[PDB]
């Protein structure tokens, strides 16, 4: 731990993407650091222009209680989640019209928690019935189905090389998978209560599971050990979203205490506090380059912090 | 200065006219959760309504649009997806009055009215429903009416000692449920008795929820 500190990092409320009229459950940052899609709960997830607070698309969706959203790496497919299990993939770059729903991917019995696109054709959902299942989009059916937890999975964080991911169970446990054999790699314990979000190391050697007892833990993929614990006795609430930086050095969490807080890759110092939200934050987003961090708090707003 | 995205902010004002239009329409309609245990009788009231995860029943009654987001059966916990329902107008609990003689077929130890009360306090004493006025339906009136005559009802409640009369014992258990709220100032727990008979009990729900928004308008202007 001879690495020098990084000082106090402050970031300001550079933007205010108002326009929503209910809570917000997911703000996934697009494929080209430019557009974000915000998952409402009134009736309408909309896509944003981050640079100029413009809403390019009002998508009135059926499953009126969204719980996650995702922007495809090809930039033209946005997929709402839900709790009535129909992870309906929407189409954006449509010939001659506004917007359309492509394939209503029914086939889960729990509730959709975090669906993230592996590529433009394979959407890896993660639901609340111990099933983080891959799919095939135009077929409308599953391809594989991953079981091996005991409770239910609450989050998903895809690896950069599109080979594997990590499972955010309620089991105080995280699960390593594969995408080309359907096999258990390892399963990592250490937390106490359920966890709510994982993000991934940008080099693909770790993943930070955000628990509900105010602790993050940076695990491994090759050494079979948790590396660094995150704790501060003044803070007591539950994590809702974890995000690394572009380098994996800075860490952006989001808490139930109406604010973020910025830890370290090794030092675990509460450097930044991105306060300014009324209700709790819900989701984060760190771009493919790093020029923005935006939160998705339940007060119907989003603020982008740089 | 606004080169030719001046038509783009023309559009981003146009759908921001419609998000304010549908958002002022979807706030007039009343959203009401109905939550029930296993076989408590929630399938009869949606059959008494007008009209795989949750369902939704956008019925209406007497110049008011309703929504009705039934839970159905999510196999995961109610500790995880229950955040979504904060801001519901008036939840609905439902228990069958007849669901007291049989024991639940999961462990056969705790009674059904001992487990549904153990499910009632989980949703009346939790953070996200401190001011959502419960409207619980005591269900299966007539099938319990025949049930109370041949039953001393000592299996469910040992502490009660009175007559096994429907106008006494079922009127007792109405006060056995609605005294679980630790905040009897903000949660106006109404009650009703309905079965497959006793039709048009949504006339009560139309007049109950109308006595919630006025109690939620007067509370928000400081008056109450």
């Amino acid at each position: 731990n001879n690495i020098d500190p990084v000082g106090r990092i402050q970031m300001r409320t550079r933007r205010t993407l108002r326009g929503h009229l209910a809570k917000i459950y997911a703000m996934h940052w697009g494929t080209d650091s430019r557009l974000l899609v915000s998952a409402s709960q009134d009736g309408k997830l909309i896509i944003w222009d981050s640079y100029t607070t413009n809403k390019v698309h009002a998508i009135p969706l059926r499953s009126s209680w969204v719980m996650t959203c995702a922007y495809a790496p090809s930039g033209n497919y946005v997929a709402c989640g839900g709790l009535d299990n129909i992870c309906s993939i929407y189409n954006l770059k449509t010939r001659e019209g506004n917007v359309r729903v492509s394939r209503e991917l029914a086939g889960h019995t729990g509730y959709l928690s975090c669906c993230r696109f592996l590529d433009d054709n394979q959407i890896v959902t993660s639901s609340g019935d111990t099933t983080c299942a891959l799919w095939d989009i135009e077929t409308g059916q599953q391809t594989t189905t991953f079981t091996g937890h005991t409770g239910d999975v609450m989050s998903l964080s895809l690896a950069p090389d599109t080979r594997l991911f990590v499972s955010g169970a309620c089991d105080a446990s995280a699960k390593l998978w594969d995408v080309r054999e359907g096999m258990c790699r390892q399963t990592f314990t250490g937390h106490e209560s359920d966890i709510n979000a994982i993000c991934f190391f940008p080099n693909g050697n770790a993943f930070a599971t955000g628990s509900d007892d105010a602790t993050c833990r940076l695990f491994d993929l090759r050494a079979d050990q948790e590396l660094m614990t995150y704790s501060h006795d003044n803070i007591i609430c539950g994590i809702t979203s974890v995000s690394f930086s572009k380098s994996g050095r800075l860490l952006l969490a989001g808490y139930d205490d109406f604010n973020c807080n910025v830890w370290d890759a090794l030092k675990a110092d509460r450097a930044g506090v991105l306060a300014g939200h009324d209700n709790r934050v819900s989701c984060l987003g760190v771009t493919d380059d790093g020029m923005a961090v935006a939160t998705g708090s339940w007060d119907s707003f989003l603020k982008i912090w740089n | 200065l606004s080169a030719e995205d001046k038509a783009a902010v023309e559009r981003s004002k146009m759908i921001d006219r419609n998000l304010r239009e549908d958002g002022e329409k979807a706030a007039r309609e009343v959203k009401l959760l109905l939550l029930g245990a296993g076989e408590s009788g929630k399938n009869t009231i949606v059959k008494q309504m007008k009209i795989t995860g949750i369902v939704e029943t956008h019925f209406t009654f007497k110049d008011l649009h309703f929504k009705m987001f039934d839970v159905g059966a999510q196999r995961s916990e109610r500790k995880k997806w229950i955040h979504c329902f904060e801001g519901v107008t008036a939840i609905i609990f439902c228990v069958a009055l007849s669901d007291y003689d049989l024991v639940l077929a999961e462990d056969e130890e705790m009674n059904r009215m001992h487990a549904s009360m153990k499910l009632f306090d989980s949703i009346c004493n939790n953070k996200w429903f401190t001011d959502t006025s419960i409207i619980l339906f005591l269900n299966k009136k007539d099938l319990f009416e025949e049930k109370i005559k041949k039953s001393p009802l000592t299996i469910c409640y040992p502490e009660y000692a009175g007559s096994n009369t429907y106008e006494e014992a079922a009127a007792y258990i109405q006060c056995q449920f609605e005294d679980l709220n630790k905040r009897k100032d903000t949660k106006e727990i109404y009650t009703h008795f309905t079965c497959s008979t006793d039709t048009k009990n949504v006339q009560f729900v139309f007049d109950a929820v109308t006595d919630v928004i006025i109690k939620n308008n007067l509370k928000d202007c400081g008056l109450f």
Partner: single-chain antibody
Amino acid sequence: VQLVESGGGLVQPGGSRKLSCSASGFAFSSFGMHWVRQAPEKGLEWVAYISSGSGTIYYADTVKGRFTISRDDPKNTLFLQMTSLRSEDTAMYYCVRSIYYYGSSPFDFWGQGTTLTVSSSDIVMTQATSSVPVTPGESVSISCRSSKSLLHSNGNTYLYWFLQRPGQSPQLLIYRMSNLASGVPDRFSGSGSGTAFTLTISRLEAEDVGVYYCMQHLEYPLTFGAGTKLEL
């Protein structure tokens, strides 16, 4: 996917007519509708435009005051009613569908076009060549210039290429001078400075031999130039 027009005939100068570009095949209400016309031997010329939801109504400065225009959105049409018809307004009128957001493609689908026989400040760009004869299989590049730096400070150049196959509507090819549209192959390429522009048409084929065009889109009104015809 479909646009139809009507309202032709032979009127003396001093008459009136209500043109009717009826709309179908798409969600018409959330589109921008332009009214580019073509001289019977010379180039294209913008006339009028209505925004989405009858918003920013414009006009061309040459017809600034004489023509009335509206849209019946429950009928999905355009009411180009003309008053005091002049002899210089002989055109085969086109009715263009445009849409404006980030990463969009305005002027993507055009009208089919009906003719109109009448009897008897401004940013202006220029063409490069009126005609260039090329035998196919040669990878011809064409160029264009203007009288302004069309490289506005938000980082994008507002010039839209086109192509008119001889007889039919002017199909778009390249939008924002560097982005391939939908329906063109991956052999074209555009580039350009603030003022000068170009287009690389590599490996010529059948039927993509018509007259080319250009359109600045920095400020209104819109210019087209005489258009580079391609010969064989």
